């Protein structure tokens, strides 16, 4: 019984978690999951300034009532060669990473490891967070709330 938390360095606070490497988390749990880390989803506001602080991403997540990449760099495998926050208008599908916002993170550039799930709840889960340096930090809990999630 494990979930693995694949994490990126904070821009401005903002970073992205993709969980198992997969796209597989719904929007209810993408709440859920900021929440574990003491953090938000991120507003438009918040995500333009962490793109502007060198933030891209080729992977679609979560924000506040939308589902973005930031991107810096045209590539035309992420995001159809678009840049700036590009907004995923027509999909099928329900399932995405997240992007978490943290106010407590600095205001710029962080790509030291993140260590812990603060707001993790008592569970059954072994939850591991895997930086992209592969270090891991690995406690046993839960953090989803909504039934339809587990
Ligand atoms: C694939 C992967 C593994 C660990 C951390 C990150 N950010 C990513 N993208």
Redesign the pocket.
């Given at each position: 019984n494990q979930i693995d938390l694949?994490?990126?360095c904070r821009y401005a606070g903002v970073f992205?978690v993709?969980k198992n490497?997969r796209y597989s988390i719904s929007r209810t749990e993408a709440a859920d999951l900021c929440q574990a880390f003491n953090s938000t989803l991120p507003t438009m506001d918040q995500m333009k300034l962490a793109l502007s602080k060198g933030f891209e991403?080729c992977?679609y997540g979560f924000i506040e009532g939308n589902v973005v990449i930031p991107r810096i760099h045209p590539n035309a495998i992420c995001a159809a060669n678009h840049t700036g926050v590009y907004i995923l208008v027509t999909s099928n599908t329900s399932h995405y990473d997240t992007y978490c916002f943290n106010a407590s993170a600095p205001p710029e550039e962080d790509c030291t490891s993140v260590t812990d799930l603060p707001n993790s709840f008592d569970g059954p889960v072994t939850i591991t967070i895997?930086?992209?340096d592969?270090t891991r930090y690995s406690k046993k809990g839960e953090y989803r709330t909504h039934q339809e999630d587990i």
């Open positions: 694949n994490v990126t992205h993709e490497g991403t992977r895997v930086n992209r592969g």
